[PDB]
């Protein structure tokens, strides 16, 4: 019951009376579940964790199993030090044993607890896996139709599975990922918004790594569903779906092509103008890795009408987004055909590119100077350098370039002078 002192909780838990122990454990749970500043450290210092862990095994008193599971879940929701206290008390195998509880609310609470422990970081994630958590977790989801499961239960299962997919140095064990993926792909087709969001997060973590990890995911055929979720009205779904798509196009040309083949580029007029600045940034970053691809992939960018959207972002966007756009342009001009590059200029890339040369940011200045060099090399292939030179002078570009001559950074000077020397002298 309500607002016990820690002193009274300890007295109750130290009684040799299981019903007294239950009342005291519920009182601890309520303290730990209040809105403001749960006294986690006070409960830890009182030495209560080993008793709570012992209560997880009291099969004939399912209420104290539930109450201690909740209390421990909330201690483990805290700092790494607080999560470690729960693990140090032997809680991981006790919670795994509760996954097979005939009481659904107790099984669910154990799922949640293991999610908190795994969510601490890669070491505790891997320790939860070594204790054998994955088989019984997946067994709870081995049903013909996920819709027969309680919505809250299914959401907790999905979230906990996503933490087993989360974090790097190291990434999760390859065999654990393979074991989880088929269930994860089913969750990715479930019609609940929170299950969809957490499934996308899981996929985004799994694709955040070397191309071999990306391939494990792409082979399971998820890209079309990711592209569908790219267009969800829910921002909590779009954000991780976009991260996952973005991760995939950091991969091989073939992996990138799967994204293009599933129709992803048709969603980018909206993504590149999205009111959430983080979405615009991630979408432009994604575009920059696609224009880093083959000439036929650059051509698909052109065919979907996306070069004017890059011109737009270069013209006006949050500065970090403009940066990604500069990179998209330098990549485009690096790998593209002469005709592709010419098309870029006709779309109006030069003036907004020149205006960003005012940036008090060294990296983007280098990136922009590189693109200009690239565009000049295409123009002389057509023997039209002065024509481009004129365009740069008129919009004030030449002024900035000969300003970048007095610049502090090595490579910026050399790039600036060489431009002046070859095309403006």
């Amino acid at each position: 019951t309500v607002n016990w002192s820690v002193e009274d909780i300890v007295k109750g838990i130290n009684s040799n009376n299981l019903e007294s122990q239950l009342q005291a454990t519920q009182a601890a749970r309520k303290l730990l579940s209040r809105e403001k500043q749960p006294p986690i450290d006070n409960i830890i210092r009182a030495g209560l964790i080993p008793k709570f862990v012992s209560f997880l095994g009291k099969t004939d008193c399912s209420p104290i199993q539930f109450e201690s599971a909740w209390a421990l879940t909330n201690i483990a929701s805290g700092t790494s030090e607080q999560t470690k206290a729960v693990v140090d008390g032997g809680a991981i195998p006790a919670f795994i044993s509760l996954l097979a509880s005939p009481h659904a609310h107790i099984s669910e609470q154990a799922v949640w607890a293991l999610g908190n422990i795994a969510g601490d970081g890669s070491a505790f994630r891997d320790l939860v896996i070594k204790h054998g958590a994955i088989d019984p977790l997946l067994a709870l989801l081995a049903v013909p139709d996920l819709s027969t499961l309680a919505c809250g239960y299914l959401r907790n299962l999905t979230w906990t599975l996503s933490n087993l997919c989360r974090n790097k140095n190291p990434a999760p064990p390859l065999d654990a990922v393979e074991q989880i993926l088929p269930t994860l792909v089913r969750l990715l087709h479930h019609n609940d918004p929170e299950v969809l969001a957490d499934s996308c997060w899981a996929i985004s973590y799994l694709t955040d790594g070397p191309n071999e990890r990306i391939e494990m995911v792409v082979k399971k055929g998820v890209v079309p569903q990711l592209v569908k979720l790219l267009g969800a009205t829910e921002l909590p779904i779009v954000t991780p779906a976009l991260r996952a798509i973005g991760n995939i196009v950091t991969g091989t040309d073939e992996q990138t092509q799967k994204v293009i083949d599933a129709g992803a580029l048709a969603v980018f007029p909206s993504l590149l103008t999205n009111p959430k600045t983080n979405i615009q940034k991630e979408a432009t970053w994604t575009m920059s890795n696609i224009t880093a691809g083959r000439q036929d992939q650059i051509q698909q960018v052109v065919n979907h009408g996306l070069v004017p959207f890059l011109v737009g972002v270069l013209s006006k966007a949050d500065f970090k987004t403009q940066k990604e756009a500069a990179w998209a342009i330098t990549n485009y001009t690096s790998g593209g055909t002469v005709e592709q590059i010419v098309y870029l200029v006709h779309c109006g890339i030069i003036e907004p590119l020149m205006n960003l040369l005012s940036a008090k940011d060294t990296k983007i200045i280098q990136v922009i100077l590189d693109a200009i060099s690239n565009i000049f090399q295409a123009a002389e292939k057509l023997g039209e350098t002065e024509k481009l030179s004129i365009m740069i002078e008129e919009c004030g570009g030449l002024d900035k370039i000969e300003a970048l001559q007095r610049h502090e950074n090595e490579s910026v000077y050399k790039a600036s002078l060489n431009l002046i020397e070859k095309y403006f002298s």
């Binding site: 309520k30 730990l32 579940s33 949640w112 969510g119 601490d120 933490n163 955040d208 991760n247 959430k276």
Partner: peptide, 27 residues
């Protein structure tokens, strides 16, 4: 070439991300 996802000083979740831990409320 391809830029793999980067570490910005605060851009792991960057507050638009997924909760790695959750406390159960109502008591």
């Amino acid at each position: 070439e391809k830029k793999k996802r980067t570490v910005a000083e605060e851009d792991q979740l960057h507050l638009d991300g997924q909760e790695n831990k959750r406390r159960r409320h109502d008591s």
